[PDB]
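FAQ: What does a ligand-bound record look like?

Like this one, built around 2BA:
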Amino acid sequence: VPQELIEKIKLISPGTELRKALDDIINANFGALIFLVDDPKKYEDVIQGGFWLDTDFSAEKLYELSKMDGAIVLSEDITKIYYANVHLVPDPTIPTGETGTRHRTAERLAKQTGKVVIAVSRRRNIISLYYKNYKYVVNQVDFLISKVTQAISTLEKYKDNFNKLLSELEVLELENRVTLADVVRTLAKGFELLRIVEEIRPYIVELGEEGRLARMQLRELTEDVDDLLVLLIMDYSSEEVEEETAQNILQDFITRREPSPISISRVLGYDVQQAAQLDDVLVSARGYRLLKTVARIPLSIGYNVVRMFKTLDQISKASVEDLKKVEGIGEKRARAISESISSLKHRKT
Amino acid sequence: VPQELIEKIKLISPGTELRKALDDIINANFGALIFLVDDPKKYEDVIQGGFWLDTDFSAEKLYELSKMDGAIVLSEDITKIYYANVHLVPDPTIPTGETGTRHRTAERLAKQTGKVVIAVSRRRNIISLYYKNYKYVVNQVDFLISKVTQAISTLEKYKDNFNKLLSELEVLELENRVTLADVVRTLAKGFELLRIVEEIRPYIVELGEEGRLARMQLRELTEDVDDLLVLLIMDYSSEEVEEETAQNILQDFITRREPSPISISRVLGYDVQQAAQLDDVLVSARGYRLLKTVARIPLSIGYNVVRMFKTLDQISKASVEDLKKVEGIGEKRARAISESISSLKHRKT
Amino acid sequence: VPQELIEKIKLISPGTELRKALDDIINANFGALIFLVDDPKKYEDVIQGGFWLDTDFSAEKLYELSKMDGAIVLSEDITKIYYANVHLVPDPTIPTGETGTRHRTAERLAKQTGKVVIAVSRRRNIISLYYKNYKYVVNQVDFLISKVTQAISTLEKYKDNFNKLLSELEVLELENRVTLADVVRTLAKGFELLRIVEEIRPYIVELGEEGRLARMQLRELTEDVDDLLVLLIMDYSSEEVEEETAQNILQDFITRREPSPISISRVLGYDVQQAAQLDDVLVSARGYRLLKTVARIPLSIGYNVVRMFKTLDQISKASVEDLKKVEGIGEKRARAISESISSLKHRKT
Amino acid sequence: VPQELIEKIKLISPGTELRKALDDIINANFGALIFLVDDPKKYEDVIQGGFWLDTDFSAEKLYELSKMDGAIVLSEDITKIYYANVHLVPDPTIPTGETGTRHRTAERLAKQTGKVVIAVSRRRNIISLYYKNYKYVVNQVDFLISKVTQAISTLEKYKDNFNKLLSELEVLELENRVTLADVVRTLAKGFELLRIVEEIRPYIVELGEEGRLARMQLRELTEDVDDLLVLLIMDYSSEEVEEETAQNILQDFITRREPSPISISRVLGYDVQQAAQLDDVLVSARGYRLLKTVARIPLSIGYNVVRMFKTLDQISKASVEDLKKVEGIGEKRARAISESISSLKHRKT
Ligand SMILES: Nc1ncnc2c1ncn2[C@@H]1O[C@@H]2COP(=O)(O)O[C@H]3[C@@H](O)[C@H](n4cnc5c(N)ncnc54)O[C@@H]3COP(=O)(O)O[C@H]2[C@H]1O
Ligand SMILES: Nc1ncnc2c1ncn2[C@@H]1O[C@@H]2COP(=O)(O)O[C@H]3[C@@H](O)[C@H](n4cnc5c(N)ncnc54)O[C@@H]3COP(=O)(O)O[C@H]2[C@H]1O
Ligand SMILES: Nc1ncnc2c1ncn2[C@@H]1O[C@@H]2COP(=O)(O)O[C@H]3[C@@H](O)[C@H](n4cnc5c(N)ncnc54)O[C@@H]3COP(=O)(O)O[C@H]2[C@H]1O
Ligand SMILES: Nc1ncnc2c1ncn2[C@@H]1O[C@@H]2COP(=O)(O)O[C@H]3[C@@H](O)[C@H](n4cnc5c(N)ncnc54)O[C@@H]3COP(=O)(O)O[C@H]2[C@H]1O
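The answer part, i.e. the structure of the complex:
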């Protein structure tokens, strides 16, 4: 979705005085046909008749003005009301797939002037915004909150299965009994989870000020899933992988690549064709996840610890002194790794 | 519900251009009486007057056309609009239990031609689809999402009690202190849970594209309950039972047989009449559930392990070598069974 | 609420053909004034004019008939439609606090005949049912599901705090470190929880067939709270108390007595005035809760075990043989008590 | 928000007969312009024409009276209806930013008389209450329950992350491995959580009797978060802090100060500028949280225990006798501290 159009959809997002007026116009079954321009003079050929107002804009003035036939002309920044009750006359030969004279006039005029045109018909209750060759239908807040509420509810469900997989994987990690199947199942779920988010983002945006609580909900639910997934890929990929690299694999399984078990294991560096094979491939965490999250060791110094010990299993067998031989590890970060790792083995297994 | 009718209900499911038009017609309080046929000529006797259109179909064309009196005739695949404003004249002697001339004409005509007929009255806001001797009332999306949201909410509650029973049964399983009552209580709940799903499936289907999130929610909630229940029946039935057999018992307690404590224990091979008896019948898991789910041993090779050890208790007392004597168990699947079982005993008890 | 009136509210509960018609009448803004009697002849003095129908009842017939002025007369069992468009003439001197001629006529006539009278005004959308000196306003399904959904949601919250208290009390019970404060806090919460249920029951009832899922939700949420609370009172009351007695204390703290910390401890047999005192009163479970729920020992035989050991602490120190000396305890119920108790001490503490 | 205005908003809160009438007026699209005064005589100059009623007030009388043009005059306590159909004539020169003659008359008249004036336009469906120079727009119940339901839902999410942080911090506390970062992260979340509450309080208030369940939900969710947060600040602040002091820091991070990681640690007495520094600052709980909550030791006597041992670590190493040397600690409070602390170390780590 063009960012050029996003800045336009903002103009009529919940919270703006312009949207407040549109809502009143819809609820009042009045019609609306708004033309947004910066210099009316430059477009005096597509604007006929009506009344020249040139007054400050307000929701109430726009609402009252929409009680009349025709179009209203506003300054692009929505701070002025230039015309009212005018006859918009764009080129009739410009292509349009819209219905009704108001909408066909809207799209045509937007294309022609490269400006924004808003249309609201008395019959239906949708807000249609035309920019250039773009068309965006703005849904009512209640429809959006309905979809959003459902999505969030779906995410809770996914986040739950994710936590269960992750806590079970944790046990397998400490006991060094992890299989590729286990890792993939966890990654798969986390990928799916983040796709849901990406797919509802636009909905959140159309909510504007009414999207406040939904953003807060999403943030609590996906708080650290991304870092956790990147750390998982760094700990189980076939061969050493930099964080930046891992972040791309994540991004890639959220936009394009489908989180398929076989597909995920493949991109991780494991050559498999049969899904059943995964349960046979034994793997061992490198140790990044446990070093940054629990041991609170910066990923940068973690690279050194991994370099010298290779896996979490060897790191958990290391001693405070051994660890101290690592570049970036003093006495504090040494006991941190040690105690934190031993603590988890005693409590989770 | 006939599958022949399901393919028809799809024609007007949320997501289709045809339903989009019907919704606009309802919201606009216009009436509608649609006749779907492939060859108009063949039915020129039930079609009188109106205008011959023979144009491509579109939601907007149908919406506008419904502003006129009479019926609209469309091609069965909803890609053409043949007539508009016609007078449908089915045989008045065909039985009908409907009200109002529009609906009685609808059902009669559907019966007569064996074709689909849709009726929407200006007064009410329901979509009535007539096929042959079938009649399906399509509810609005908001009514469906309301029922569905409640059901899902009810399932969460059931899934919770299910997890609690299952985790407690787990403890009893490892400690080999399981009683028939325990197993039945768990099976009962899982059966109830899956019935809820089956009973709301039709609702999900009427939602069409608006059922996307509801399907995803249901899938996370019932992710593996079915396999888990089949494995429970295989581990506690009175005498050895094949998976296929277990799958039928499950299916049977989801469609016909009521998940009654006494009824479930009975079908499991235990002869009981008094509910209080269950707490007295001591039972021991065969070990399938723990072998496939935790040990990730294919059910097929599991049959061999069960054959040689009979119960989970004996399997947990077996050694890596002992297990290796089983057909299908090498060194990996041997340690898998061993370590996984011992791991659970140490963590859960 | 009189049970005599409950049987009347059923007549217009969601699911009945009569309510289906009323809903259509409300949605269509038609008015309604229904008089339910068994023998029209006996009331020919309060019924003037109109048309004598004496036909089978149906929602459609009632809906159509309500398009006319006046009242409709139906048989008490709603299987016949006697009159339509009649003028109901009850005694004008009968007291009534209602507004508008339709409602004042309704209440007056119900009082006079001791029969049921239903009124629906075109203006508002409520269903008013008059019986004798009773008046019941039936709310729409959407309003009910809204309140119910909130209550259920509130219960989840309470059930959560209840589980947390109960699981913590469990730890204190096994470790024999329970204080009166702990018990009261748990009882208090469970009492509150069940009050919520009692207070929303009427709402559930007004929902009729639309209350199906709400009943199922409530049942999962309050599944065994009552037995659990009775067992708590039996295990911590100041002196030995029979189950029946405990069940009355529960019932009493759900209807009359407010679940006050000081009030609860008082009724339990402990003489306290200051809330802060509770944290000082040391108490020890008798053992009923653990014997019936976990050990699955019938409350009747439990009385014997408690008799001989007094507290759970002594029971957990008892041996299989010791327990066998109890009337009703063989070898199975002996190991049951033993293993189950020791199992919990090892897992929870 | 002035408390003087709060007492006014109550007059039209859900549950009051006055609001019941307003709702009926809105649903009936009638207009309303109410003037509340105690002595009509004193204002006979702003009141012209209409009918002098001087009758008892009732929702039905007000509803019927609003069917006429003009304003209605009521006694300030809403127990009398003085005028109806009058012409309110406030000073036209009083400033007003309202639209339409009804609203401009409302605000002007409220300012002039310092009395309350209510306005409801036929077009829209909002209730505008004017007091002095204050203006309060009362939203419908459905809009409020929607926002509230979302907020509560958002809180659940926060309360969850809070519990997870707190339970993890618990482990670190017992193991005496707590870092400033850990404490701040937990405090931050709890602060955020309580802000949500404060920010939705006004919504709850506008709900009146329809806010009952929402208040109960909030109470279960935030049951003891405040005490828990105060105890956290007392246990980890840089230097000894009195409860009253801690309560102010809490209050301050809920109203003004933003719960910023760096900002929180700073106010706790730790001099830091870089967020990354927190993970390096080792800290140790004083022991208040564990003494009051678990050991149930009054905060007052806790001060003594902390005085003599300084930290929870030393308290957990203390013996029953050692503790007995503390002012306020006998044998019971001595074993309480001991057993409770050792119990937690054995179960959580
Ligand atoms: N060139 C044409 N070809 C066919 N029919 C024509 C027509 N011009 C006008 N009409 C018919 O007149 C109806 C109402 O015209 P109206 O100006 O009141 O009411 C109009 C007008 O206030 C506004 N509008 C449409 N186009 C406009 C334009 N180019 N400039 C300013 N306002 C416009 O939208 C309203 C409704 O449009 P809608 O099509 O639903 O309804 C149209 C249409 O059925
Ligand atoms: N044979 C008959 N017996 C008794 N009354 C008769 C009748 N024929 C017509 N009417 C009366 O005229 C009303 C409206 O006729 P209309 O054609 O405008 O408006 C009709 C028409 O546009 C459509 N419709 C009904 N039957 C149809 C058919 N066989 N073919 C095409 N359109 C039909 O549905 C609309 C409403 O039907 P509705 O019954 O509610 O309303 C009917 C009914 O009260
Ligand atoms: N004795 C009286 N005193 C003062 N005003 C009188 C009156 N009798 C009739 N009216 C006026 O006429 C209005 C409509 O009469 P209507 O018979 O059409 O329409 C009536 C009628 O169909 C029905 N209804 C009321 N009382 C009834 C009765 N005793 N028997 C049968 N139907 C009744 O309810 C409808 C609306 O009643 P609503 O009061 O809202 O509206 C009443 C009222 O304002
Ligand atoms: N001084 C003035 N300047 C410009 N226009 C004037 C005017 N006085 C009256 N009107 C026009 O007449 C409309 C309706 O007057 P109305 O008395 O029926 O119906 C009125 C009246 O019943 C009530 N209302 C307004 N001001 C009032 C006042 N000072 N005292 C009592 N009632 C008032 O609110 C209704 C609607 O007001 P609304 O402005 O929407 O609608 C107004 C407005 O467009």
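Follow-up question: can I read anything off the structure? Yes, for example: The first strand of chain B starts at residue 32 and ends at 37.
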